Amino acid sequence: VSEIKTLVTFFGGTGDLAKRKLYPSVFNLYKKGYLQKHFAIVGTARQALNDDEFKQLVRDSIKDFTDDQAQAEAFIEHFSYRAHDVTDAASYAVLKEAIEEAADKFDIDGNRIFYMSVAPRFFGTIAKYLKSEGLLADTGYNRLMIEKPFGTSYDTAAELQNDLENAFDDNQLFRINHYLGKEMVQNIAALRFGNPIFDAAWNKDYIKNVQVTLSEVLGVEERAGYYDTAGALLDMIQNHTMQIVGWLAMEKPESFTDKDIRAAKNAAFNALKIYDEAEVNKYFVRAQYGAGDSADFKPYLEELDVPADSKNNTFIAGELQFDLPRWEGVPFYVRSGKRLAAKQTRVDIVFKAGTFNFGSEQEAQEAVLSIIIDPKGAIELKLNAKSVEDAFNTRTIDLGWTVSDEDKKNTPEPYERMIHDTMNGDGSNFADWNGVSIAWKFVDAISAVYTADKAPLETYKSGSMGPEASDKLLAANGDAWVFKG
Amino acid sequence: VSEIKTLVTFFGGTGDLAKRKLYPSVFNLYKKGYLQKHFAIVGTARQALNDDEFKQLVRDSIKDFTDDQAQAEAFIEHFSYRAHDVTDAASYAVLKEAIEEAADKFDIDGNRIFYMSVAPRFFGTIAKYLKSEGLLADTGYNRLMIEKPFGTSYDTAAELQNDLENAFDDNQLFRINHYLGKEMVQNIAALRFGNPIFDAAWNKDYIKNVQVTLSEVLGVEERAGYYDTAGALLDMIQNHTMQIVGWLAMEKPESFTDKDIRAAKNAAFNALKIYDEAEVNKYFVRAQYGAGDSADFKPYLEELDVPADSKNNTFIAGELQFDLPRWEGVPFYVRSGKRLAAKQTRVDIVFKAGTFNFGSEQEAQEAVLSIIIDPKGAIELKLNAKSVEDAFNTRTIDLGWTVSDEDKKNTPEPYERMIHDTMNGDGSNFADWNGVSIAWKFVDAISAVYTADKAPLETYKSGSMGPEASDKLLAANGDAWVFKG
Numbered sequence: 026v027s028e029i030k031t032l033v034t035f036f037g038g039t040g041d042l043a044k045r046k047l048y049p050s051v052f053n054l055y056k057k058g059y060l061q062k063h064f065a066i067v068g069t070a071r072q073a074l075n076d077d078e079f080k081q082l083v084r085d086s087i088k089d090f091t092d093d094q095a096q097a098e099a100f101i102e103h104f105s106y107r108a109h110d111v112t113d114a115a116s117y118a119v120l121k122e123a124i125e126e127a128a129d130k131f132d133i134d135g136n137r138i139f140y141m142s143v144a145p146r147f148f149g150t151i152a153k154y155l156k157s158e159g160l161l162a163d164t165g166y167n168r169l170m171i172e173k174p175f176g177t178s179y180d181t182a183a184e185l186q187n188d189l190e191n192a193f194d195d196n197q198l199f200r201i202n203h204y205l206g207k208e209m210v211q212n213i214a215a216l217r218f219g220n221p222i223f224d225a226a227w228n229k230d231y232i233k234n235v236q237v238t239l240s241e242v243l244g245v246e247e248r249a250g251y252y253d254t255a256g257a258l259l260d261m262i263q264n265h266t267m268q269i270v271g272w273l274a275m276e277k278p279e280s281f282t283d284k285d286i287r288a289a290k291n292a293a294f295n296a297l298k299i300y301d302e303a304e305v306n307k308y309f310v311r312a313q314y315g316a317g318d319s320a321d322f323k324p325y326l327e328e329l330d331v332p333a334d335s336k337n338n339t340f341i342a343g344e345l346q347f348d349l350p351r352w353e354g355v356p357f358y359v360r361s362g363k364r365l366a367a368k369q370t371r372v373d374i375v376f377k378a379g380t381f382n383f384g385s386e387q388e389a390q391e392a393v394l395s396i397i398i399d400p401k402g403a404i405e406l407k408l409n410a411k412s413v414e415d416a417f418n419t420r421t422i423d424l425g426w427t428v429s430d431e432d433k434k435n436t437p438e439p440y441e442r443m444i445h446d447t448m449n450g451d452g453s454n455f456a457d458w459n460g461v462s463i464a465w466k467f468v469d470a471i472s473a474v475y476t477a478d479k480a481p482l483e484t485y486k487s488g489s490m491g492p493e494a495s496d497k498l499l500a501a502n503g504d505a506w507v508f509k510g
Numbered sequence: 511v512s513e514i515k516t517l518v519t520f521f522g523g524t525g526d527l528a529k530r531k532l533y534p535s536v537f538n539l540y541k542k543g544y545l546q547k548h549f550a551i552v553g554t555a556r557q558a559l560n561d562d563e564f565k566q567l568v569r570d571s572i573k574d575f576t577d578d579q580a581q582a583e584a585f586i587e588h589f590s591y592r593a594h595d596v597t598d599a600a601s602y603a604v605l606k607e608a609i610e611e612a613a614d615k616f617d618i619d620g621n622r623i624f625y626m627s628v629a630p631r632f633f634g635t636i637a638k639y640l641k642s643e644g645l646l647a648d649t650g651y652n653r654l655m656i657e658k659p660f661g662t663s664y665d666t667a668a669e670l671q672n673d674l675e676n677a678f679d680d681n682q683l684f685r686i687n688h689y690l691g692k693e694m695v696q697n698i699a700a701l702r703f704g705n706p707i708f709d710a711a712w713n714k715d716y717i718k719n720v721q722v723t724l725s726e727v728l729g730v731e732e733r734a735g736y737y738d739t740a741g742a743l744l745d746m747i748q749n750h751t752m753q754i755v756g757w758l759a760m761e762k763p764e765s766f767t768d769k770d771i772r773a774a775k776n777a778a779f780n781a782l783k784i785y786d787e788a789e790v791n792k793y794f795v796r797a798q799y800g801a802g803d804s805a806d807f808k809p810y811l812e813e814l815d816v817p818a819d820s821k822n823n824t825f826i827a828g829e830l831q832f833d834l835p836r837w838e839g840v841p842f843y844v845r846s847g848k849r850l851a852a853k854q855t856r857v858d859i860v861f862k863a864g865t866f867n868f869g870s871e872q873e874a875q876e877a878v879l880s881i882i883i884d885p886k887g888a889i890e891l892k893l894n895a896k897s898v899e900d901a902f903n904t905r906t907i908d909l910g911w912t913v914s915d916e917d918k919k920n921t922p923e924p925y926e927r928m929i930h931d932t933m934n935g936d937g938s939n940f941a942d943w944n945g946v947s948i949a950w951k952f953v954d955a956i957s958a959v960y961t962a963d964k965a966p967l968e969t970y971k972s973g974s975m976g977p978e979a980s981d982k983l984l985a986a987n988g989d990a991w992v993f994k995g
């Protein structure tokens with residue numbers, strides 16, 4: 026394979042994320058022969074640990090992925106550590122030492138990635154000092170991987186963007202969105218543009234409505250403290266949902282380079298309508314899970330760290346509208362919630378029913394292209410065919426495909442993808458500023474109404490697919506949710 | 511169900527066909543509650559048999575379909591017989607007696623079907639006398655079911671049509687084509703017109719080529735005597751293949767009535783090009799099966815009743831061209847042979863590869879809509895998607911659907927369909943004169959070259975999918991056979 030010559034500095038290199046996802050993902054890239062000799066990993070955090078102590082943390086991190094110990098050790102030799110506080114301008118010279126030390130040790134000509142696996146409050150600070158204290162490579166490239174969340178509103182997001190642009194150009198900024206890193210999500214473009222029958226049908230003339238569903242069976246359980254101010258709206262809608270919707274709504278690009286892809290996606294984002302109070306109440310539904318049937322499924326209000334009077338949303342459902350010629354009048358439905366019927370991340374393209382009359386008792390119904398992303402990748406197509414009856418009549422049948430075990434096992438985890446992409450300088454599977462700003466602008470209009478409590482808070486039985494209002498939402502346009510559970 | 515009040519007269523009612531297919535198919539229609547009180551079946555042939563003797567023939571015919579004996583007997587009471595020679599004008603009064611006897615006995619107001627399950631030489635004769643000797647109902651309808659083959663060339667077919675039109679209008683003539691009676695073949699129209707994504711793509715702008723395959727693993731074995739002068743060309747191509755091609759090539763009808771359907775099909779038939787000697791050699795391949803690997807698979811030349819110097823075709827492959835705006839430049843490939851790799855009656859719609867460039871090592875390939883008719887009904891769609899690789903790349907995946915056992919078991923046999931349709935007066939699943947004449951005109955041009963031996967006779971290993979020339983046929987237009995065995 027072609028060797029990837031890069032140097033990655035992990036801010037928050039002792040954290041849970043670095044141990045669970047980051048390091049093993051890097052190890053996988055090494056096992057696959059991508060990272061060979063010319064690469065180094067510099068871990069950093071406040072806590073002091075000498076190289077020997079750090080390497081053990083790295084060793085444990087990749088234990089469940091180690092099959093050949095000698096291979097693990099060869100990899101560990103590329104790791105170094107330095108205790109350091111990010112708010113200490115002077116302490117950055119220490120870090121610069123380590124980085125330049127590693128650069129010489131493995132003969133890495135520039136090419137530096139700075140992964141900020143730290144709390145958001147440190148994002149801008151770290152950036153300023155990466156430039157001012159001279160940590161940025163003078164050759165190759167310099168890329169900054171920003172962890173979730175990129176802001177908590179448009180203002181905060183915009184401020185963050187300003188602090189970061191002081192040291193980097195937007196094309197050097199790789200914000201983390203793990204849903205964009207999911208293999209199945211990257212199939213959307215291949216299915217659409219790769220098959221003229223679908224490419225030519227990806228518009229208002231053929232499609233009735235589009236559906237994006239991020240269903241989870243888990244409750245808040247653990248992280249209520251943080252989740253009580255974020256809700257489904259910011260936790261899953263603003264980031265995950267909106268960026269998938271962007272892959273679907275995008276115009277047809279001039280080519281498949283991240284640049285044209287982004288331009289095409291932005292063409293749709295700039296067309297997305299932002300709602301006012303009256304419209305939020307019209308096109309959106311916010312809900313909170315109550316008890317299920319089992320005692321084990323207690324209401325949201327009884328979860329650890331949840332205020333007894335919380336009006337937070339554990340479920341969101343809504344209709345997006347793109348004022349683009351190609352999507353004129355096509356509803357884009359999105360939903361995401363906790364304590365639902367099943368875990369399911371899927372996209373449903375519902376085509377308009379044909380108008381040809383067969384004379385049958387059952388005329389043509391809506392065809393559906395379904396792309397299942399989680400739990401297991403699958404592609405299904407509901408088509409109109411003839412029923413096995415004496416009198417001519419139509420009926421829908423479901424064509425199906427599912428990933429094989431060879432596919433399932435060779436599929437890279439989102440984090441391995443994102444990192445690998447950043448090293449390659451490919452922004453296709455990353456949201457740019459324009460996408461994020463609009464996603465926030467859109468979500469902020471909704472949040473404003475909820476914060477002001479000028480919209481209803483529906484409820485739902487823990488284990489259903491949401492409040493009934495979710496169904497009535499679609500019914501108004503004569504639509505229904507494809508996935509029922 | 512709505513009662514079907516009809517009276518059917520079976521010419522050749524002692525024959526193998528009447529016993530194997532005809533009678534049981536009628537019994538099924540009775541079991542399904544369609545035929546109730548007002549119906550009668552008059553069997554006829556030269557051989558003398560009294561009612562008691564005939565009913566036993568009918569009883570044995572439906573033995574393997576009898577689960578309730580009392581039900582079988584109730585059905586048998588509707589049968590009568592009369593010995594009769596079809597060339598005896600005077601003996602027709604006897605038959606008229608039986609028919610009118612049955613008509614009174616079961617109170618059937620007209621509605622008569624005359625099934626000619628006799629050798630072709632008797633078709634015209636029987637027709638003349640049905641009219642002249644007054645056997646045609648004066649009320650209701652009168653329909654004539656003509657068994658295969660309807661002619662053996664255009665001239666003979668045209669003569670037959672003339673003799674029959676002396677007593678019937680073309681809309682009363684129901685020629686037997688059991689392939690049109692196959693449930694899956696009737697799905698073509700539903701899939702196409704019932705799904706706009708396919709309906710809008712059923713043209714030269716989307717499709718690369720169309721493929722019809724009637725593959726058989728059986729050799730001539732039994733009927734070589736008849737088969738040696740018919741060959742694959744007339745045995746499977748002229749009738750079965752051509753009429754399926756008609757369901758695919760047809761324009762889009764004004765409605766789904768047999769009239770508009772036929773008009774649409776004829777729009778294509780009238781556009782079909784007829785070849786000359788040079789063109790037959792260019793667009794067609796004729797072959798005869800040689801030995802396989804196993805001794806059991808002996809060459810055609812060693813089959814019972816096959817002349818040691820026979821140049822007969824046990825396999826045919828060819829390219830059809832429709833000079834219609836919508837099919838301009840779209841090849842229609844057809845193939846049918848004996849001693850092939852597998853039994854398979856399927857249709858493959860190969861769509862053009864998309865021209866969008868992804869930059870991948872593997873660009874978009876041709877999508878394929880496959881409709882499998884025999885052995886088991888299935889619908890498959892080969893689509894372009896993303897491969898499970900690190901570097902973005904496309905790959906084809908196969909979506910699939912297969913008939914359930916509920917479908918398989920509730921699906922009516924071709925003969926039951928054809929009869930049931932004739933009683934309903936529905937000609938949708940029947941070739942009209944226009945279709946048959948053109949089918950013959952097309953086949954005759956080819957036969958002329960073969961008879962004159964001004965075209966090569968290829969050969970193939972018993973068990974392959976044909977001679978290599980079959981592959982080279984498609985390769986010339988940059989195509990290949992979807993089904994490989």
Ligand SMILES: O=P(O)(O)OC[C@H]1O[C@@H](O)[C@H](O)[C@@H](O)[C@@H]1O
Nearest residue numbers: 203204241243260261265370399
């Ligand atoms: O569906 P996945 O990829 O496991 O992601 C689900 C998780 O996605 C995270 O982004 C959310 O913060 C969590 O609340 C959620 O549970």
Ligand SMILES: O=P(O)(O)OC[C@H]1O[C@@H](O)[C@H](O)[C@@H](O)[C@@H]1O
Nearest residue numbers: 688689726728745746750855884
């Ligand atoms: O494929 P099916 O429907 O069994 O039909 C196959 C038969 O069809 C008949 O029409 C041919 O005369 C036979 O030679 C052939 O074997």
Ligand SMILES: [Ca+2]
Nearest residue numbers: 356501502503
């Ligand atoms: Ca509406």
Ligand SMILES: [Ca+2]
Nearest residue numbers: 841986987988
């Ligand atoms: Ca050609």
